[PDB]
Amino acid sequence: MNTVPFTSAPIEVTIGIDQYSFNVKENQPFHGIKDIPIGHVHVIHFQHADNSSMRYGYWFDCRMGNFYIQYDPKDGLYKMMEERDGAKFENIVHNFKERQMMVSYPKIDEDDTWYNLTEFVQMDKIRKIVRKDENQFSYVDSSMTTVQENELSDPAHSLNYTVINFKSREAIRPGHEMEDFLDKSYYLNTVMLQGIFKNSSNYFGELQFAFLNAMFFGNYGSSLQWHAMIELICSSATVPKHMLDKLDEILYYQIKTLPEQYSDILLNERVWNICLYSSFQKNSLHNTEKIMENKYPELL
């Protein structure tokens, strides 16, 4: 169980760790988060009390290094940094734990929610979508645009999601226009799975990472990417049975975790109605169809 200590909390902030969150008061003696489960990626995220503009946060894996948070009064945000000195770090954490200045990652033993949301998400794939190779952790915020959003403006600050476009030469084989447009199996199986992602695990990792960025940061481009990757599978007549079964599980936990009050902004009516009721896979997503019908029947 690993620890992300904080130097201090000089500004009033709602702190998120994965699906949990805590309100911290201005100059409250908060010095971080302990008992963080090894073996998953994590996200530590922030929403200032005095300016709810710019939700922002850091994706990290405690296996890759020792990470702490320190407020920068110049750039006006909580920054993640790596401590390269192992013995200084252990010594800092031990001190704060002794004075019980840390909140405990509040994981219930029965509860697999985080595992279920991050099953295919790997730090190495996050660091290719979020390009800043000098850091082992990845910054994301509300306002960051995707490569695809930018095509339709600072390249260095982009989310490099895989571009998906149903009316592109990549999606449509010359001479198979109607077939490839109505049945996206070619585009899913040859171009995206065999070609770009190499396997369904990498495809699901990006889908899950797009969702979490949409949910935790209200990142609109991330939401577009999540919907596009769902729609590409649902609109394919030929999908390996293991992928359909896994997609149903993935979407079920995403819909289960989504705050009830964000379904109006985070769920696209057209995509979900098409995926559940009109598409090739309308009958392949039993768990997802039952939770959507019981939790968000107005959308459909």
Partner: protein
């Protein structure tokens, strides 16, 4: 975006454009089977691809053999229309290729866009205009070449005959849409108006009668009256 009453003059500017109407591509008679079920029998169709500026009509005849052993024909018909328009554009020299294609039915947008991916600079536009191009098959010579076709065929017409010698393309289009609107509302009465006078003939190389400027005013008036007479019946107003 959409072509409407607001941007109507754009049809007659010097930017090459084509209207595509797919209404007459997939044509059927519905009939009873020996067992008292219902079945369709296809007849020959056509794509109606028109340059509104020049009057040049690219009438692609859709032979019933196209449909043999295919499913979901009303859906296929949009994709086949898009395949054939794309093939037409690729067959034209660069300086002849349109800048814009306007589809008369919004269901043709995605099929045409996907078939024209190789032409990113050709805009595919809908229209809010309700154009009467369905009545193309009420023009005897177009109807004749479609029904007699025994194989896929492209036939080239000028739908304005020689009118552009005397009138502008705005006025020629207004005349064409009024004639087609009349033929669509009451075909019998429209044909009577056009051929009632035995002395006025259609040139071998033309679609419409050889009317003087004054005879066209009379004909145009008779067509307007027909459309109001018929609208008087429809709605009882």
């Amino acid at each position: 975006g959409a072509m409407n009453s607001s941007n109507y003059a754009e049809l007659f500017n010097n930017d090459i454009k084509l209207f595509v109407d797919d209404t007459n591509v997939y044509r059927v008679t519905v009939h009873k089977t020996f067992e008292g079920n219902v079945a369709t029998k296809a007849i020959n169709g056509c794509i109606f691809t028109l340059n509104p500026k020049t009057g040049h009509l690219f009438l692609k005849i859709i032979h019933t053999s196209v449909w043999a052993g295919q499913k979901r024909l009303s859906q296929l018909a949009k994709w086949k229309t898009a395949e054939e328009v794309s093939a037409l554009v690729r067959s034209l020299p660069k300086e002849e290729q349109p800048k814009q294609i306007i589809v008369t039915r919004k269901a043709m947008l995605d099929p045409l866009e996907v078939h024209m991916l190789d032409f990113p600079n050709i805009a595919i536009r809908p229209t809010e205009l309700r154009l009467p191009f369905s009545a193309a098959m009420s023009i005897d010579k177009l109807s004749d070449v479609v029904m007699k076709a025994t194989e896929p065929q492209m036939v080239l017409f000028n739908i304005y005959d020689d009118w552009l010698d005397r009138i502008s393309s705005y006025t020629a289009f207004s005349r064409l849409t009024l004639l087609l609107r009349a033929l669509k509302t009451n075909e019998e009465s429209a044909k009577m108006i056009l051929l009632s006078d035995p002395t006025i003939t259609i040139k071998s190389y033309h679609l419409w009668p050889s009317f003087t400027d004054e005879q066209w005013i009379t004909i145009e008036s008779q067509m307007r009256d027909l459309i109001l007479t018929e609208y008087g019946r429809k709605y009882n107003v």
